[PDB]
Amino acid sequence: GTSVKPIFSRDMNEAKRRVRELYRAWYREVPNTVHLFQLDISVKQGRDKVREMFMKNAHVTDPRVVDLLVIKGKMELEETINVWKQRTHIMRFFHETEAPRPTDFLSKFYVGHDP
Amino acid sequence: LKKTTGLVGLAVCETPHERLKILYTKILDVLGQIPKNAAYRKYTEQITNEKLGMVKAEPDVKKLEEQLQGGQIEEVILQAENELSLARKMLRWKPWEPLVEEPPANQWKWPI
Amino acid sequence: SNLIEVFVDGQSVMVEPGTTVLQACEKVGMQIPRFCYHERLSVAGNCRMCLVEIEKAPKVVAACAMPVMKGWNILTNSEKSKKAREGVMEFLLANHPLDCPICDQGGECDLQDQSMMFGSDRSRFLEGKRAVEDKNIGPLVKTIMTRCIQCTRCIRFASEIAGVDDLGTTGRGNDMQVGTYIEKMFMSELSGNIIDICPVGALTSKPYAFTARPWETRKTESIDVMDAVG
Amino acid sequence: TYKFVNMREPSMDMKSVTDRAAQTLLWTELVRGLGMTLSYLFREPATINYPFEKGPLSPRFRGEHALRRYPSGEERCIACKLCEAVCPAQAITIEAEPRADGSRRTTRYDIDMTKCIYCGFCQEACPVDAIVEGPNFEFSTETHEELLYNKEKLLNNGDKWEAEIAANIQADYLYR
Amino acid sequence: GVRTSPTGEKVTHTGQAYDDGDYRRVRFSDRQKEVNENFAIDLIAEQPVSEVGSRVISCDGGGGALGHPRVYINLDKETKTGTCGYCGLQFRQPHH
Amino acid sequence: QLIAVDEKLDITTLTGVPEEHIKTRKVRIFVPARNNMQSGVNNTKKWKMEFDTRERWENPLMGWSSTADPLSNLVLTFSTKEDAVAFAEKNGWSFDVEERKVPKPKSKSYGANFSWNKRTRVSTK
Amino acid sequence: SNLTLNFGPQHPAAHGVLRLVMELSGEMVRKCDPHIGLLHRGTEKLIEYKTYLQALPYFDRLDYVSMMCNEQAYSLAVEKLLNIQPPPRAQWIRVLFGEITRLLNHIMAVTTHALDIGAMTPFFWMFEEREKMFEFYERVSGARMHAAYIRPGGVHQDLPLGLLDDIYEFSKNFSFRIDELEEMLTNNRIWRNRTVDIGVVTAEDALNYGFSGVMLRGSGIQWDLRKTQPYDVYDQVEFDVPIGSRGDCYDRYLCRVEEMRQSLRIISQCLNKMPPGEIKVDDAKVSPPKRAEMKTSMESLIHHFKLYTEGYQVPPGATYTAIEAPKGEFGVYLVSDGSSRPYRCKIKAPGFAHLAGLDKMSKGHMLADVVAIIGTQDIVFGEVDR
Amino acid sequence: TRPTIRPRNDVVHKQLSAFGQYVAEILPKYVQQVQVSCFNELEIFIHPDGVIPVLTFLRDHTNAQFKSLADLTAVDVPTRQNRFEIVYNLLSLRFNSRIRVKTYTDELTPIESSVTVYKAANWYEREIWDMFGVFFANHPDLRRILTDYGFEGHPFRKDFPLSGYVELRYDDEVKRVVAEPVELAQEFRKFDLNSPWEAFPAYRQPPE
Amino acid sequence: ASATRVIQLLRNWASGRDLQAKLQLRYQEISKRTQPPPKLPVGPSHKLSNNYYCTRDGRREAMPPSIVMSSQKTEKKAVTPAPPIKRWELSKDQPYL
Ligand code: SF4
Ligand code: SF4
Ligand code: SF4
Ligand code: SF4
Ligand code: FES
Ligand SMILES: [Mg+2]
Ligand SMILES: [Zn+2]
């Protein structure tokens, strides 16, 4: 029951199919992105980052949430392909000027009060 | 007779009486396929019948325009076509049925 | 059972015998304006801000002291109630000093808020104002007596809650004043509470003076550790 | 009630046709435009000799902020914080305490001039005419930090501009 | 009422001067420190106390609508003087 | 057409909040206490959701109050505690709820001020 | 493949921070994709954190060429929600300064349109007049453009003691300046070639796409909000509404010039009909009292304190208030939850719909024609992005 | 009651009430509520499924003729189970009137795009999607319109912080503009202005 | 203004109008920069009697919207939102530009 209306997919199988299609499109786009934006990363780095972004949301079990995630990923792909994005936008995925924040207890205790 | 309807993209109508009669007959024909107890059907039939009677009773275009209160009979023709299209859509939609769903108890409560 | 039915603005409610009009209005969620009534002090009835109209009664009653009668119909928003509140606010503000920018009560003033909500927006008072000398009741409670509206909350709290009979009123009429009449320190372990219950800037915190305004403060609800009461 | 801007028909008599042909071939309206520019060439330009000549201003003009004093030399500000509450940009920062003589005075009074929108709401809100927007507008700095005013800077502005600020207030306070 | 700290820095009306080990003093090197020289506490302390023949006096800071809100000061205490809470002017009754 | 989704509602991956501000945060759901300086009760009617207090420090220039907490100002208003709990749950925030505290009904009696033999008699009025 | 070109934001013809991504075959425009948001400042959320008086200066900065018209729309919305009424003299002042503002906006629009086209001279002639009107703004409020004069209770201050005479002196010379502008542009064959039959929109399309103002009236639609849904004292002034015939850039230019003339007419009427009286609503729980009262009376001081710290509370409810701003219908959807801060403020700007229709209006045109169409839509991106 | 109080108009109130009754009778399938505000502003609450029919009827009906869409926006009310309130404002030139149509949705439920009914909606629906995250079904080209490229979250939502989560600055080591977690030199100072005394008795809620 | 009369004649001929009659620079006909003080009339609520605020309270007369046709709860002639607009008149001042 729970009486919900879908966006595109009726169960997780169709949602997974759409996820795979979007992943294929991003995988094909990465080399062109590296060429056009004149990025100093490799194609391997770009595809690894695409996989990491996809795996960030691997725990989702709602087909509607997956449909919205695919819609957002398609929005980002359309944005990248048309060059609406600049090199700064593409490089924002890699956080190159962010100092690594530690995760163990002792370093956090040393730096400050935040957990 | 008249040049320059005055609205861009609205051509002057030659023989507007015949066009209006044809359009109103088509509108009534479409309304005939709606359940008789539906409010849309009776309201649209009433207004269409008044407009058709006005068109039939007034051979003069400017006097008919002043009677119809519809602003420059070419616009009356356009509105008749719009009503015909809406009538077909309403036939497909059937909005006279009972309310589809009832909203949550505090959905329209304001403030908060 | 023993409940009696009364009406607040034409709406039925069941109340215990001896319940005041103010509490019955509170049952339906309406707050009667007040200055001298405190639900933890003994009823005084002096401020006269709580006057309300009972249907088919020519005289407004004091809601904080009058017990509801069976079948009564309070009318909290009638013209008579509104005019009573406006007149009482006018008499309250007649001699009040123009002290809001320098008063610590500034954004937390019951007098200010009830003037904005129930009083008029103007003055027709064309006389001079009264001024009274300040009292010194110790290092904790700052005293600016001109601001006093003579609610007598401090006197009732000190006598009944704190157990001290140091506060009182000397003189009578317009010149009546709240104080100790002698140089005395109102020193007790519950003294600072007279700052909270005083509705105006007559009694303020001396350590807190001038440091902050209420709208800029952030509120953190917490517990005290100075003793074992928590 | 309406009029038409482009519903005029041209005359078709031989004289009108010949006049329009002369307009087309001999470029009469273009010479009209040339005449208009030539006319403007011989007018006096509306330029002013800045900085020697200044643009006109008003007593209500909103400029650089200043903190004022009473004629005794005592500051007018009593730290009511109404200016800080009303400021739509949150450009005002105030800290206060009792002075050594028990007076209610500020210990911090900052205006961030790069947050300020120069609306004048603070001088309306001030109940003792302590904070004003003075007449000055030529205070461009070379660094961002010079535009973060503290109480000393604002008191110095008041001391420097009081003569003109009081004369501006005298000319406008009856409209306030 | 200006006065310098042991470091040579002027002390403001507020009383804040950077401490000897405070690095923030570096912001003044090759530049200056803004200090207003007219101390209000000292200037108001020079005004003479006004003697009035009434128990209650009124103050509006002078200038009518150009001063502060009008307030009334009680002058019954003879051990002190009545001080305006807005302007700082002092009032007393003729004593002794 | 309806598809009968079976799982609990969860929208964290769509809100765009960085994960640090989803997992390490604690919200408080409560009816705010009446300000003891006043008698009005109009600010004690609705439920509030607010986040935990984070570090504030002093700006080296001007000595302003600096923060690095983006949720230090966010306050949400709800009709009922259930709505607040549902919002916090679907947004993935750990929450602490406090039951609403109401003043107890008190028996007032003006005449008790003048008791013949009771302790309630007022020594002054 | 079509050539893909960035038009702006750093372009003279852009008229602000617009990134017009254009697909072109030669110089023919195959597709227009306006990318906006380069001036989105998040104004509506900010307005949610302010009181109703603190949110007023935002409406100055929405459309920075029609400041008081933006202020008037917001003030009307708040006054409707407060169930109060501005005094008559305030309403006459509002209409007078709204017409002065319409003059300012129309000068800016026409001269910047001519400057894009290539006729650079009329800009300098008309900006001296704009300067004098800025002086009028400054005398009344102390600010040249972001005045914040119109408030939800009326106006902030009464006019200074010699302003009407100077407004009269300015108004009796402006028609000759309009005449010189028309001599420069109206009958020039080059200007007509650059404007006639460019960006033609039909009445039906203009209505459906959400157009308003001149973009309607150039296509023959007879609609002016001052005539159909009057506000303030617009029902007491007489003026004509210019109407076009062809729906092109040339017709829109003529409409704006004639609108400028009709504004002069309305200003003349407002000057001769200004009544006496107070300038804000005589209700100190909404409008602040005078300073002398604030310094003498206890109630006045309490109300001044509360109005400047907390602000007035607005009874709960939502309104959509619209005015005939110089660029079209300008609206506010204002939602009050009962407190002194607005719960929601949605701003309706005509430039939003006009720019959304720019792609439709540029079909079958070249690059220069697209520049002319952007000029003829009268776009300011403060109101588009907000 | 005369000089400072806004005057009433009962004729327009009656006309709008009658027309609201008209609309409700014609479309019972979708119309849930009809209201006429005190300042004469007709409001019609409907079911989401009836977005396209209602609007179509309202723009096409001879007695309606609301051919122009003033604006379309959304309101976020977190306490409601359906978070978002979709508001359409329509103007009729033939009858010189205005009407407001309101519906509701939540985070995961699409609304039918009304570009077919009104061409003006395109950018309005894009803006609602960008600011609030409400998806519109069958929309021609749905994408962000106001926010920056790659911006995560929806700013207009009540939960979103006023200053957001990231800021921008130019970094010389990478020679480009970078996005980093927001740090503020001065924190925005939250004010508590709401008065503890009730202002409007007419809107008092039952004590539950 | 101040210029040679021959230049004024050339200006008038080129522009086609008498330029001197409507000069665009303000020479001396504008208001003085110093004015007498004003007096400013008070409002209608400045009465000393019969001025109770409850009789001039516009905020307190606002009420929640009137509910028509709650779903939760004869010929019947059709109706419109408002009467049709009257057609506009053609500007007896100047109908055609
Ligand atoms: S007690 Fe209240 S009314 Fe009196 S001066 Fe202080 S803030 Fe103003
Ligand atoms: S000091 Fe305060 S509590 Fe005591 S009588 Fe005066 S107003 Fe009441
Ligand atoms: S002028 Fe406006 S923005 Fe600037 S400090 Fe004053 S109130 Fe704030
Ligand atoms: S400047 Fe004026 S408003 Fe601001 S704190 Fe000082 S006295 Fe108050
Ligand atoms: S509260 Fe009842 S008399 Fe004071
Ligand atoms: Mg107190
Ligand atoms: Zn004084």
Q: Provide φ and ψ at G124, rounded to 5°.
A: -70, -35
Q: Of C29, C214, C215, which is closest to H204 when you measure between CB atoms?
A: C29
Residues with Cβ within 8 Å of C207's Cβ and at least 6 positions away in sequence, in order, are C140
Dihedral angle over CA of E30, E33, E37, E42, nearest 10: -140
- Region for C97 from its dihedrals, namely left if φ exceeds 0, alpha if ψ lies in -120 to 50, beta otherwise: beta
Going by C-alpha positions, the residue among D57, D59, D56 that lies closest to residue D175 is: D59
Is residue G20 classed as helix, strand or coil in its secondary structure? strand
**For residue C153, which atom of ligand 2 is closest to its CA?**
3
What number of C-beta contacts closer than 8 Å exist between C and H? Answer: 33
Q: Do I97 and D175 touch (CB under 8 A)?
A: no
Mark out the alpha helices in chain E (DSSP H runs).
40-44
Q: Of C34, C43, C159, which is closest to F110 when you measure between CB atoms?
A: C43
Residues with Cβ within 8 Å of E36's Cβ and at least 6 positions away in sequence, in order, are D151, D152, D155, D156, D159, E12, E13
Tokens 């210019």 appear where?
G242
Q: How many CB atoms lie within 10 A of CB B93?
A: 20
Gap from CA of G50 to ligand 3 centroid (Å):
14
Burial class of residue A103, CB neighbours in 10 A (0-12, 13-18, 19+): exposed
Q: Do chains E and I touch (3 or more CB pairs under 8 A)?
A: no
Q: Provide φ and ψ at G52, rounded to 5°.
A: -65, -30
Q: Please, how many CA atoms are within 13 Å of residue I31, restricted to the half-sphere of its CB? A: 20
Q: Bridge-partner residues for G280, per DSSP?
A: G154
Q: How far is CA G257 from CA G105, G202, G260, I8, I84, in A?
A: 11, 21, 5, 28, 30
H or E element that contains A62: none
Residues B39, H169: Cα–Cα separation, whole Å: 62
Q: How many CB atoms lie within 10 A of CB E24?
A: 11
User: Which residues, numbered 90 to 109 in chain B, qualify as contacts with chain I under a Cβ-Cβ cut-off of 8 Å?
Assistant: 99, 102
Q: Spell out where chain B is interrupted, by the residue before each break (C to N > 2.5 A).
A: none
DSSP string, D101-143: TS-EEEEEEEEETTT-----HHHHH-SSS-EEE-S------SS
The answer to whether residue B107 neighbours chain F at the CB level (below 8 Å) is: no
- Minimal-distance CA residue to ligand 3 atom 3: D116
Residues G161, G168: Cα–Cα separation, whole Å: 14
Q: Do E74 and C101 touch (CB under 8 A)?
A: no
Q: Bridge-partner residues for E19, per DSSP?
A: none
User: Chain F: nearest CA to D126, how far in angstroms?
Assistant: 23
Q: Of C83, C122, C124, which is closest to I54 when you measure between CB atoms?
A: C83
Which residues in A lie closer than 8 A to residue F14 (C-beta atoms)?
65, 68-69, 72
Residues with Cβ within 8 Å of C205's Cβ and at least 6 positions away in sequence, in order, are C104, C140, C141, C142, C192, C195
The answer to whether residue H182 neighbours chain I at the CB level (below 8 Å) is: no
Q: Do chains A and I touch (3 or more CB pairs under 8 A)?
A: no
- Region for A51 from its dihedrals, namely left if φ exceeds 0, alpha if ψ lies in -120 to 50, beta otherwise: alpha
Residues H105, A64: Cα–Cα separation, whole Å: 14
Q: Do H189 and D85 touch (CB under 8 A)?
A: no
Give CB contacts under 8 A, 24+ apart, made by B81-88: B81/B23, B82/H60, B82/H62, B83/B27, B83/B44, B83/B48, B83/H60, B83/H61, B83/H62, B84/B23, B84/B26, B84/B27, B84/B30, B85/H60, B86/H56, B86/H57, B86/H60, B86/H61, B87/B27, B87/B30, B87/B31, B87/B34, B87/B44, B88/B30
G365, G373 Cβ separation under 8 angstroms: yes
The number of residues in chain E equals 96
Mark out the alpha helices in D27-127 (DSSP H runs).
28-41, 82-86, 121-125
Q: How many CB atoms lie within 10 A of CB A56?
A: 12
What chains are in contact with D, requiring at least 3 Cβ pairs below 8 Å? C, E, F, G, H, I
Gap from CA of C32 to ligand 5 centroid (Å):
9
Pocket probe for ligand 1: among C148, C150, C200, C215, the residue whose CB has the most ligand atoms within 8 Å is C200
H or E element that contains H198: none
H195, G310 Cβ separation under 8 angstroms: yes
Largest CA distance in chain I: 87
- Region for C45 from its dihedrals, namely left if φ exceeds 0, alpha if ψ lies in -120 to 50, beta otherwise: left
Residues with Cβ within 8 Å of C58's Cβ and at least 6 positions away in sequence, in order, are none
Q: How far is CA D145 from CA B27, D110, F64, F68, G332, in A?
A: 74, 13, 14, 22, 38
Burial class of residue G353, CB neighbours in 10 A (0-12, 13-18, 19+): buried
- Provide the terminal-to-terminal Cα distance of chain C, rounded to the nearest Å: 39
Please give the structure tokens belonging to residue C52.
Answer: 């309300």
**What b-and-e string marks burial along E27-61, b requiring 16 or more CB atoms within 10 Å of the CB?**
eeeeeeeebbebebbebbeebeeeebeeebbebbb
DSSP string, H49-65: GGHHHHHHHHHH-TTT-
Q: Does domain F19-113 have CATH number 3.20.20.80?
A: no
Please give the structure tokens belonging to residue I56.
Answer: 């001039």
**For residue D131, which atom of ligand 4 is closest to its CA?**
1
The secondary structure of I19-44, three-state, reads CHHHCCCCCCCCCCCCCCCCCCCCCC
The answer to whether residue G35 neighbours chain A at the CB level (below 8 Å) is: yes
Residues G204, G216: Cα–Cα separation, whole Å: 10
D148, D103 Cβ separation under 8 angstroms: no
Residues G118, G141: Cα–Cα separation, whole Å: 36
**CA closest to B111 among chain F residues:** F79
Residues with Cβ within 8 Å of G248's Cβ and at least 6 positions away in sequence, in order, are G195, G196, G197, G198, G199, G200, G218
Is residue G150 classed as helix, strand or coil in its secondary structure? strand
The answer to whether residue F79 neighbours chain B at the CB level (below 8 Å) is: yes
Please give the structure tokens belonging to residue H148.
Answer: 């920056």
Q: How far is CA G151 from CA G50, G86, G327, H96, in A?
A: 15, 10, 21, 28
Q: Please, how many CA atoms are within 13 Å of residue H91, restricted to the half-sphere of its CB? A: 25
Q: Of C82, C122, C124, which is closest to I54 when you measure between CB atoms?
A: C82
Residues F82, F87: Cα–Cα separation, whole Å: 9
Residues G279, G268: Cα–Cα separation, whole Å: 20
Radius of gyration (C-alpha) of chain B in whole angstroms = 19
**What b-and-e string marks burial along C14-34, b requiring 16 or more CB atoms within 10 Å of the CB?**
ebeeebbbbbbbbbbebbbbb
Resolution in A: 2.4
DSSP string, D141-158: -SSSGGGEE-HHHHHHHH
Beta-sheet strands, E only, within chain G: 3-7, 19-25, 28-35, 150-151, 154-155, 241-243, 317-325, 328-336, 342-348
Residues G129, G131: Cα–Cα separation, whole Å: 5
Please give the structure tokens belonging to residue F43.
Answer: 């600010």
Residues H55, H176: Cα–Cα separation, whole Å: 48
Parallel/antiparallel/unpaired status of strands E90-92 and E82-83: antiparallel
The answer to whether residue D43 neighbours chain G at the CB level (below 8 Å) is: no
C123, G298 Cβ separation under 8 angstroms: yes
Pocket probe for ligand 2: among C198, C204, C205, the residue whose CB has the most ligand atoms within 8 Å is C198
- Region for C204 from its dihedrals, namely left if φ exceeds 0, alpha if ψ lies in -120 to 50, beta otherwise: beta
Which residues in G lie closer than 8 A to residue E85 (C-beta atoms)?
none
Q: Please, how many CA atoms are within 13 Å of residue G205, restricted to the half-sphere of its CB? A: 18
Radius of gyration (C-alpha) of chain I in whole angstroms = 31
The answer to whether residue G177 neighbours chain A at the CB level (below 8 Å) is: no
* Residue C128 per-residue DSSP state: P
Q: Provide φ and ψ at H200, rounded to 5°.
A: -125, 100
Radius of gyration (C-alpha) of chain E in whole angstroms = 20
Dihedral angle over CA of C200, C204, C208, C209, nearest 10: 80
User: Chain B: nearest CA to G203, how far in angstroms?
Assistant: 5
**Domain limits at E61?**
41-92
H or E element that contains H69: strand H68-76
Residues I80, H18: Cα–Cα separation, whole Å: 8
Determine what percent of chain H falls in helix, strand and coil, rounding each to the nearest 5: 20, 25, 50
**Domain limits at A99?**
1-115
The answer to whether residue F80 neighbours chain A at the CB level (below 8 Å) is: no
Q: Please, how many CA atoms are within 13 Å of residue D55, restricted to the half-sphere of its CB? A: 16
Identify the nearest ligand to the CA of C35 by its number: 5
- Provide the terminal-to-terminal Cα distance of chain H, rounded to the nearest Å: 34
Burial class of residue E10, CB neighbours in 10 A (0-12, 13-18, 19+): middle
Q: Do H159 and F91 touch (CB under 8 A)?
A: yes
**CA closest to H73 among chain G residues:** G346
G212, G352 Cβ separation under 8 angstroms: no
Tokens 């960006």 appear where?
G199
CA C120-C122-C126 angle, to 5 degrees, is 125
Residues G294, G283: Cα–Cα separation, whole Å: 14
Experimental approach was cryo-EM
Radius of gyration (C-alpha) of chain C in whole angstroms = 19
Q: Please, how many CA atoms are within 13 Å of residue H68, restricted to the half-sphere of its CB? A: 23
C182, C132 Cβ separation under 8 angstroms: no
Residues G352, H71: Cα–Cα separation, whole Å: 10
The single-letter code of the amino acid at E56 is V
Pocket probe for ligand 3: among D111, D121, D147, D157, the residue whose CB has the most ligand atoms within 8 Å is D121
| Residue F125: alpha-carbon gap to chain centroid | 39
Domain count, chain A: 1
User: Which residues, numbered 83 to 112 in chain A, qualify as contacts with chain G under a Cβ-Cβ cut-off of 8 Å?
Assistant: 84
Going by C-alpha positions, the residue among B40, F106, B112, H119 that lies closest to residue G344 is: B112
Which residues in C lie closer than 8 A to residue G293 (C-beta atoms)?
123
DSSP string, F3-18: ----SPP--HHHH---
Q: Do D1 and G241 touch (CB under 8 A)?
A: yes
Dihedral angle over CA of G109, G111, G112, G113, nearest 10: 80
- Provide the terminal-to-terminal Cα distance of chain E, rounded to the nearest Å: 33
C50 labelled binding-site residue = yes
Q: How many CB atoms lie within 10 A of CB D135?
A: 19
**CA closest to F20 among chain A residues:** A115
Residues C176, I92: Cα–Cα separation, whole Å: 77
Q: How far is CA B61 from CA B23, B68, B76, G220, I85, in A?
A: 17, 10, 12, 21, 19
**What b-and-e string marks burial along I58-83, b requiring 16 or more CB atoms within 10 Å of the CB?**
bbbbbebbeebbebeeeeeebebbbe
What chains are in contact with E, requiring at least 3 Cβ pairs below 8 Å? C, D, G
Q: Of I56, I68, I85, which is closest to H1 when you measure between CB atoms?
A: I56
G34, G18 Cβ separation under 8 angstroms: yes
